């Protein structure tokens, strides 16, 4: 066995979620050591959302204006600061459940798990991918801001995303744990286009390699193609151009299955030019691109 | 917002997973209080898998033949017992991270989160549904046995599934936390048919209600139908018969959206009789049935 979207265990992150209240606005924060990270638009009221001056708004706020609650515990704020679009509230007590972590800015096409939280309490976890346009197709309601995306390797939690806002198309935009927005998006109430949503070609191929491993093989053909020939049939369907680095990324899967990478591209070429004819690949009627060449290997071990 | 499969936070369950070793076989166990639950086929060697006599095999095992490790900790077994197809290893130390739990046998059509574990360490979490044929379409490799499915309500963890084996069709079969297999499946190495895989009609309708909430509305029509008329067009496509209880289950969503239940059935009837014509509903090209009328409400709050 089976194959399906699988998220990392959320235990390591549940212990770092807290409630942040700045006046009327309430959202979630990340408690790591003696610091709490949250979106900086907490200081925004209701009439300061079109084009707020976070510098001026932050000057009118003091330490006692921020209330952090790790459950029923009350953390004291002994210092605040604004790094890019994130607020760093220095607290007096260090999180006793702080895991080995690190802030990383993922690349477009990589996956990560999201722990959706409301009022500081986790609600659910699901897998997401950093779309080429630097957006994420997630599920967030009002109050979900502050939720983070993370990757768990061995025992080190790698935080890479913090939710900030939604876009008119329904997709979501956020920043890394250093306050740097992913994409050209800004934290101001205004319509912002995310751009054309391209398909992660390398992930689709990895999803096809996982298919041949699980028994789905009807798409395999007697055909082959060149890298330039495939990229020409991929630009028409809005597929990211496949590079030689992508081929080497899929190397382990190729030798694992015995199907050359360029042969997989030939199968994908026909799928894009002729559809699926009602068939199903790993239980899906469409080509999935949110499975990296690394999620398949760790799930098809 | 957005809509997608979302699992419960796995923190409460990660603290209850342990490694169980009975000779050469090694799998996962559930540590709750001073008892460890695991599949009873741990006592099986390699030549006792076709039709093993668990009574006789268990008589040849003593307490010191079972080794439990909660990470690097070593739990002592002071008593063992066999309840149905599950082993209850009484340990000397009670789990300090035991959450408020309860063993429940879910019904066909209900959903639950699965925490896939290998060697006692959690690997990932994903949402699953109890198929009408009493199987689950999950993702398990060798050593995944002992992993459990759970539902988290407020602060009470409701365990409802423990993985035992895979079927020839790739689907998986397991038991409740009392050792009772879901379906007519038995824990013996033999080909076992799971039966026709019916579609959870009530879940598909709830998935359509969630669609209208998120903006997907092209499937809504000027048509309506009767309950018997819909059930007749559903038996041909292997859809579970819709009952009045199902209608009342969808009541809150109906009043929430203003679309009568029988009107939704009319839209589903055309979708089954005419397909999707290449469109997409909530990012899917097929009709999803693993979203209960209760997962949509808690995700579309
Ligand atoms: C965080 O708590 C929410 C998350 C939203 C709620 C609905 N779904 C989500 O993903 N964030 C917001 O509501 C932001 C708050 C703003 C405060 C002032 C600074 C900018 C962010 N707003 C938006 O997400 C927002 C505003 C807006 C205007 C026009 C089109 C879309 C749009 N989205
Ligand atoms: C648990 O550790 C595994 C889980 C499997 C491994 C591959 N994917 C899974 O979901 N369980 C097994 O391997 C069982 C072990 C048996 C021990 C003796 C008692 C019965 C279970 N076996 C099977 O899952 C199994 C045997 C078998 C024979 C014929 C067709 C299918 C089939 N599946």
Q: Residue ranges per domain, chain B?
A: 12-175, 201-299
Q: Give dist(CA B30, CA B37) in Å, integer.
A: 5
- Residues A145 and A130: their CA atoms lie apart, in Å, by 17
Spatial CA neighbour of A143 closest among A53, A38, A67, A62: A38
Active-site positions of A? 41, 145
Ligand 1 within 6 A of CB of A188: yes
A75 neighbors A31 (Cβ within 8 angstroms): yes
Per-residue CA distances from B276 to A277, A284, A285, B2 (Å)? 13, 14, 11, 20
In chain B, what are the helix, strand and coil shares in percent, each to the nearest 5?
Answer: 25, 30, 45
Assess contact for B127 and B6: CB atoms under 8 A.
Answer: yes
Task: Give residue for tokens 């306050």.
Answer: A179
Nearest C-alpha in A relative to B298: A123
Encoded tokens for B76 = 């002592």
The tokens describing B92, both together, are 């000397």
Q: Give CA torsion, residues B59, B62, B67, B68, to 10 deg.
A: 80
Q: Are A133 and A196 in contact (CB under 8 A)?
A: yes
CA angle A214, A216, A222 (to 5 degrees): 125
Distances (CA, A) of B214 to A114, B3, B230, B272, B281: 20, 8, 25, 22, 10
Residue from the list B10, B115, B139 with its beta carbon closest to the beta carbon of A3: B139
3 state DSSP class of B203 = helix
Number of Cβ within a 10 Å radius of residue B196 = 8
Residue A250 · residue A243 · CB < 8 Å: no
- Structural contact between residues A288 and A205, judged by C-beta atoms closer than 8 angstroms: no
Q: Give the pair of three-digit tokens for residue A148.
A: 């983070």
Interface contact B9-A125, CB threshold 8 A:
yes
Choose among A9, A139, A283: nearest Cβ to B10. Answer: A9
Task: Choose the closest CB to A11 out of B14, B140, B170.
Answer: B14
User: For residues B228 and B234, what is the distance between their CA atoms, to the nearest angstrom?
Assistant: 10
CB–CB contact B299 A139 (8 Å): yes
- Contact of A39 with A162, CB cutoff 8 Å: yes
DSSP state of B154: T
Number of H helices, E strands in chain A: 8, 13
Q: Is the CB of B99 under 6 A from ligand 2?
A: no
- Widest distance between CA atoms in chain B: 69
Resolution rounded to one decimal, in angstroms:
1.9
Residue from B138, B132, B145 nearest B106 by CA: B132
All residues of chain A having their beta carbon less than 8 Å from the beta carbon of residue B14 are 9, 11
CB-based contacts of A139, cutoff 8 Å, min separation 6: A116, A126, B2, B3, B4, B6, B299
Question: Would you say the CB of residue B145 lies under 6 angstroms from ligand 2?
Answer: yes
For ligand 2, atom 30, name the residue with the nearest CA. Answer: B191
Q: Is A298 left (phi over 0), alpha (psi -120 to 50) or beta?
A: alpha
Q: Where are the alpha helices (DSSP H) in A152-226?
A: 201-214
CA of A28 to the centre of ligand 1 (A): 14
Q: Which residues of A touch B141 (CB under 8 A)?
A: 300-301
Spacing of C-alpha A42 from chain mean position: 22
Q: Which atom of ligand 2 is nearest to the CA of B165?
A: 24
Q: What is the CATH number of domain B12-175?
A: 2.40.10.10
Alpha helices per DSSP H over B27-141: 54-59
Q: Tell me the residues of chain A between 138 and 157 that have a Cβ less than 8 Å away from chain B.
A: 138-141
Relative orientation angle of helices A261-274 and A227-235, to the nearest 10 degrees: 30
The CA distance from A283 to A173, in Å, is 29
Q: Under an 8 A CB cutoff, do B299 and A124 touch?
A: yes
- CATH 1.10.1840.10 for domain B201-299: yes
The HSE-up count of residue B109 (CA atoms within 13 Å, CB side) is 18
CB B84 within 8 A of CB B37: no
- DSSP structure string for B23-39: TTEEEEEEEETTEEEEE
Which residues fall within 8 angstroms of residue B71, CB to CB, at 6 or more apart? B18, B120
User: Which residues on chain B are in Cβ contact (under 8 Å) with A150?
Assistant: none
Longest Cα separation, chain A: 69
**Chain A residues with beta carbon closer than 8 angstroms to that of B10:** 9-11, 125
Report d(CA A260, CA A264) in Å as an integer: 7
Sign of CA dihedral A112, A116, A119, A121: negative
Neighbours of B286 (CB within 10 A): 14
CATH architecture of the domain covering A11-175? Beta Barrel (2.40)
Q: Which of A4, A14, A299 sits opposite B11 (nearest CB)?
A: A14
**What experiment produced this structure?**
X-ray
Residue A260, token pair as written in the block: 């050359």
Q: What's the rounded Cα separation, in Å, for the pair B89 and B72?
A: 18
Task: Give the Cα separation of A50 and A123 in Å (integer).
Answer: 29
Q: In degrees, to the nearest 5, what angle opens at C-alpha B277 toward C-alphas B276 and B283? A: 55
State the Cα–Cα distance between residues B238 and B243, nearest whole angstrom.
Answer: 15
The answer to whether the CB of B129 falls within 8 A of the CB of B111 is: yes
A258: DSSP letter = T
Per DSSP, A32 falls in state E
Q: Please indicate whether residue B49, judged by its CB atom, sits closer than 6 Å to ligand 2.
A: yes
| Cβ contacts from A onto B, under 8 A | 106
Q: Are B162 and B50 spatial neighbours (Cβ–Cβ below 8 Å)?
A: no
Kindly state whether A107 is in contact with chain B, defined as any CB-CB distance less than 8 angstroms. Answer: no
Which residues is B117 bridged to in the sheet? B122
A29 CA to centre of own chain: 17
Q: Do A285 and B286 touch (CB under 8 A)?
A: yes
């Amino acid at each position: 066995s089976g194959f399906r979207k699988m998220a990392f265990p959320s235990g390591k992150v549940e212990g770092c979620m807290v409630q942040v209240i700045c006046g009327t606005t309430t959202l979630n924060g990340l408690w790591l050591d003696d610091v709490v990270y949250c979106p900086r638009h907490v200081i925004c009221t209701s009439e300061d959302m079109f084009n707020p001056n976070y510098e001026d708004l932050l000057i009118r706020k003091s330490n006692h204006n921020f209330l952090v609650q790790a459950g029923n515990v009350q953390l004291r704020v002994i210092g605040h600061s604004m790094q890019n679009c994130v607020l760093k509230l220095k607290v007096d007590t260090a999180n006793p459940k702080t895991p080995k972590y690190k802030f990383v800015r993922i690349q477009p096409g990589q996956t990560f798990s999201v722990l959706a939280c409301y009022n500081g309490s986790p609600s659910g976890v699901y897998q997401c991918a950093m779309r080429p346009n630097f957006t994420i197709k997630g599920s967030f309601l009002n109050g979900a801001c502050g939720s983070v995306g993370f990757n768990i390797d061995y025992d080190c939690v790698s935080f890479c995303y913090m939710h900030h806002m939604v876009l008119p198309t329904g997709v979501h935009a956020g920043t890394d744990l250093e306050g740097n927005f992913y994409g050209p998006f800004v934290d101001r109430q205004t319509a912002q286009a995310a751009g054309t949503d391209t398909t992660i070609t390398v992930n689709v191929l990895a999803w096809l390699y996982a298919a041949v491993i699980n028994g789905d093989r009807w798409f395999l053909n007697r055909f082959t193609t060149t890298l330039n020939d495939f990229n020409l049939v991929a630009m028409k369907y809005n597929y990211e151009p496949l590079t030689q680095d992508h081929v080497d990324i899929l190397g382990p899967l190729s030798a694992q299955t015995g199907i050359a990478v360029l042969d997989m591209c030939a199968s994908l070429k026909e799928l894009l030019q002729n559809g699926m004819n009602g068939r199903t690949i790993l239980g899906s009627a469409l080509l999935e691109d949110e499975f990296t060449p690394f999620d398949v290997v760790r799930q098809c071990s």
